[model samples]
Target chain A: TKENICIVFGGKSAEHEVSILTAQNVLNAIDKDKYHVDIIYITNDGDWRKQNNITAEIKSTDELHLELEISQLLKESSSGQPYDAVFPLLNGEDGTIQGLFEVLDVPYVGNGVLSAASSMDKLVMKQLFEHRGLPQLPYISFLRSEYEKYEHNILKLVNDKLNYPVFVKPANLGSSVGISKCNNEAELKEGIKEAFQFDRKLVIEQGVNAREIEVAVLGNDYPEATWPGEVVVQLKIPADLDEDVQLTLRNMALEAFKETDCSGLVRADFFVTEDNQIYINETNAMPGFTAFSMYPKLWENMGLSYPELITKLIELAKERHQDKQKNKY
Target chain B: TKENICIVFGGKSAEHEVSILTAQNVLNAIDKDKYHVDIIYITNDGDWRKQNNITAEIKSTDELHLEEISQLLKESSSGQPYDAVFPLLNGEDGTIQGLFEVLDVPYVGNGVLSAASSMDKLVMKQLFEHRGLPQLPYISFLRSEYEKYEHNILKLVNDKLNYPVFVKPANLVGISKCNNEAELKEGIKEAFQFDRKLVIEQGVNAREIEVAVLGNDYPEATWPGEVVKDVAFQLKIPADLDEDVQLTLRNMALEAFKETDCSGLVRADFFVTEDNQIYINETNAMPGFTAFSMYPKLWENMGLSYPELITKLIELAKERHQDKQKNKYKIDLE
Candidate 1:
């Protein structure tokens, strides 16, 4: 008897198309022999659709879109057995779907509500990292309401605190659409105006010329991290860095993971300067996993195959759910 | 025409019964002429039941338990037509709040992030610490670490905190105030039963003061209230403190509320030592809101009656949702 599992993707997020592609890749690679797989695709309009018993290879992203009542997720399987676990590939990345799963009392992959919610909010993520004494660049954050009422005061405070060039970004968005790298005052105003359209809060971070490195973290209670991977035109696995820098980056990645109370997986990104100064950037609760993406490639560099990684994530999800059952409430 | 609103309570939490009582109190107090109200009762079994046009008074907590298919939550007049939802239920570890978000409904009280963060003691304390708020020394560890390194954890606790320590689960559940090593060990054993993570704090002999905060961006906090516990906890509104201390507590409460990204309402608790030293205790994202509950009473002391407070919360919810609509979700791809 194969264990029952469902993969949920294509959410009401900017990453909707990317999520569909990721689902296609996952469906093709998941161990069909070891488990019975199902899929739920959320349309861009936010309607949920579930496809049962995905035994054949996914032909196209459009094929994954047979979309339904959201409550159907809680129904018993075609085999009349409850789902052993649910893997949400939706890139809402803000804990909303995770909350739905938690309310349904279903086992799911990746981080829980608190971890996903905290990690998705850049300001909250930075504060959590700061508490752990993790290295991070100076950043000034303010709400839209505050900025509207005291625009001059906020701009002055930003200027007084941080030197240009600074990166103005919407504090809660997961994508790069509302980000602006400003070098002067005019650009700063334009950036703030642009970013505020996407979110209620904004963060102005002191920009640095540094290489982008990401490390993949896995597991629940005792999570482990792979060596650093740098994002160039193409991702450089074992990112060209000193052995000590790699070790430090891996440790920082694990720290960010545990700080957010993340479970199953996270891709912790960081900025490393030419001086070897490492600053924590952010942790993606549900990082990209399209076989070509950085998260799987980081693990692959560490000798874990893409298919093996999927199986291990399911196992971790079940293990976390089992551990949660030990709790009284 | 009356605006359509729904009051949901009796969730899958230990506070299920309390939530029902709250619904009864709210139904009795809400103004009937201005709005059309409905009720959704979530049973302990996690079944959702909806009752339309709740004009009549709720006779008992059992009346709210008309149990259904959870999909009915999305139906119109009860779902899509709702102007706002006032969730009287306890935060289901922010799961219910998350559901409201996914449904894209305007809801009273905190959202997913604030509610979830405030519910976890460890995360709440860390956020407070980041805000540079005063706090007592505490140590946090996971169940896995304790299982493999029990001796080291015990040693670390002993070295960092005194014998009279307060052991509490990070998420909601068991809490024990210990006086010695034996009690500390037993307390840790019991607390871990409820949650995988535990926070042990240095116990202090201090007065417990709480302030009720209300609003969206520019939130206001009420004067500090004292918690008097004999057999059951009692609240002394406008707690007998120097004007300076009361002012400081109110300011600290507002900071805690804002730093946690809270909206609608929150009850920020603090510990004030005899010598005027103050440390933030915690903030409840959805504080108790029964007519006699401290949240309403504190606001009542500030001249906002219980009924009026409910009205204001709903207005804030609608205001927040309208404000959210101004933000663009899709980018100009061209």
Candidate 2:
């Protein structure tokens, strides 16, 4: 009676290769003896393909169309096994983000379909956050077609709350793509244009080069955050190698993770001002899993190994599925 | 510019036949010279087939797969050319339900994602009425495999609610496929036996009968019902053959439609006992379109022709899409 563990990834996301890397990394990190692994890759166009031990296919992205795939996958497995857990390694964009509800089964991931969908779009995410009373920087958007019609409004919205030297970034995009500081309208306009090129939704935030910190979270209804890790930042977007900057961003990151009903492993990104305090930037459901990635490194520093962190997540997933099963919620 | 009007029907639903009937009804009722008509018939299996001015295809009950028969019927027309409107005549359940989104562009129909997902019992539709919240009263279910553990919890939960019952027929696929209590338990067992499935979900007080209604409503959320009164008993519900289900169903259907933020024509089904009280059953974006189907007949009673109804639905769809271009929810007070 082996556990059917699925590590799924890929698709039309810009971070396609990165997802592949994570998938391979996750498979390597898991304890093979305890779990029988299924490495499923969604193709560029979105097919749920299964082959040999690893596979990719063009699946129907439509939620209903996914029913046939889900049912078929369950029926095809030996012992007619249902996936014990689905590790969504999906990365980047709206389509990839939809992998969770695309199937009717349980998935081992952070956030539900609603959050993932809204989170990828910065405008939707902020609106939702504001509705829920979460604090956020003042923002505006410039759709490419409406850039001419609403540029003035966009400029006005930002100028009203923020001074010159603000950041222009793609709303839902992660890993700091299409983001940079702009000191004036011209720079803001160019930054807006660049960010819009990546995603239709764009965001402008008040410029504050704060500390970068990260915290790993696990659980569903009762989520808790571990201590935070800071990323040293001099505006080297992502502060990946900058320890000093991230250390400053720590507390804000943990608080941010706490905001969303994030259960399972997630890393909250944040900024700390020149003064020792921290402000949350955003939360990443499944961040890049390189050896130095905040998700793994934050835990390793706190005394957990990469393998230990991965195993803990798997354990947490089983616990969550049971929780979902038992409670009325 | 050639007006592209595609009358879509016969989806992957048990009500596929009903959809085909509605598709043909639309073809017959829509104005001939006003817009070019494309009779696209969706099969019960979810393939999109098209017919050009065919009396038999639209009129007959022949099982057809559009893709396989595309060449013979010259249904090679791509859905790309922006049609000003889409007349989606579908049943409650089908993969065709999601085609509205696949059109990638907008269509003349109901809201996105909600209706199709709502129809499936695999997902939870949480209650409803007895919760005394804004929602309605309904039954809850889990796959019976979870039953052994969930039974006591289920019985205790059921004990708190009214249970004469609007029982679910479960994952049976379409209307008339539902079950009563004895049948429901068997259905749930049948449903759980399947690998990927659900039992029925229903809100009960009586065998709820629904009606169709229409009128202009956009942006504001609403629906067609009033279990709130005896209005159904005297002039409604079992008001006799003299009061045809058509009239009560239509006006109430409109209320349900507009209340739910439905944009185009919608048919609301409901429940009514020997008494005249009413409860909304469900709304169909693609309702049954037979010779006696309520969708067109209600509009027909209002002097609304099938074709005109089709055109109006399309125009409303275009208008709603344009208005939502901003898609922002915030009102800038400053």
Cα displacement (angstroms), candidate 2, residue B328, comes to 23
Model 1 misplacement above 4 A: A149-161, A184-186, A326-329, B67-70, B76-80, B141-163, B230-233, B328-334
User: Could you tell me how far off, in angstroms, the CA of residue A118 lies in candidate 2 after the best superposition?
Assistant: 2.1
In terms of TM-score, the best-performing candidate is 1
What does the TM-score come to for chain B in model 2? 0.64
- By DockQ, the best candidate is 1
- Which tens-of-lDDT digit does each residue in B1-334 have in candidate 2? 4455656666555565566556555666666565566566655544545655433324445533355321312222443344543544424432322223322334566543234323433221221121111223444443422465556535633564443333344434322233344544555555454422333334455544545544334322122223334653411322232255436555555444432334454555666655655555555655554545555555555566666767777777676555443221111110
Instruction: Report the poorest 10 consecutive residues by lDDT, candidate 2 chain A.
Output: A59-68
Colliding pairs, model 1? A49-A67
Give the winner by lDDT: 1
lDDT of 2 by residue, A18-38 (tens): 777666667667777677766
Candidate 1, residue B49: CA error in Å? 2.3
What does candidate 1's lDDT look like per residue over B25-47, in tens digits?
Answer: 99988988877888888788777
lDDT of 2: 0.51
Model 2 docking tier (incorrect/acceptable/medium/high): incorrect
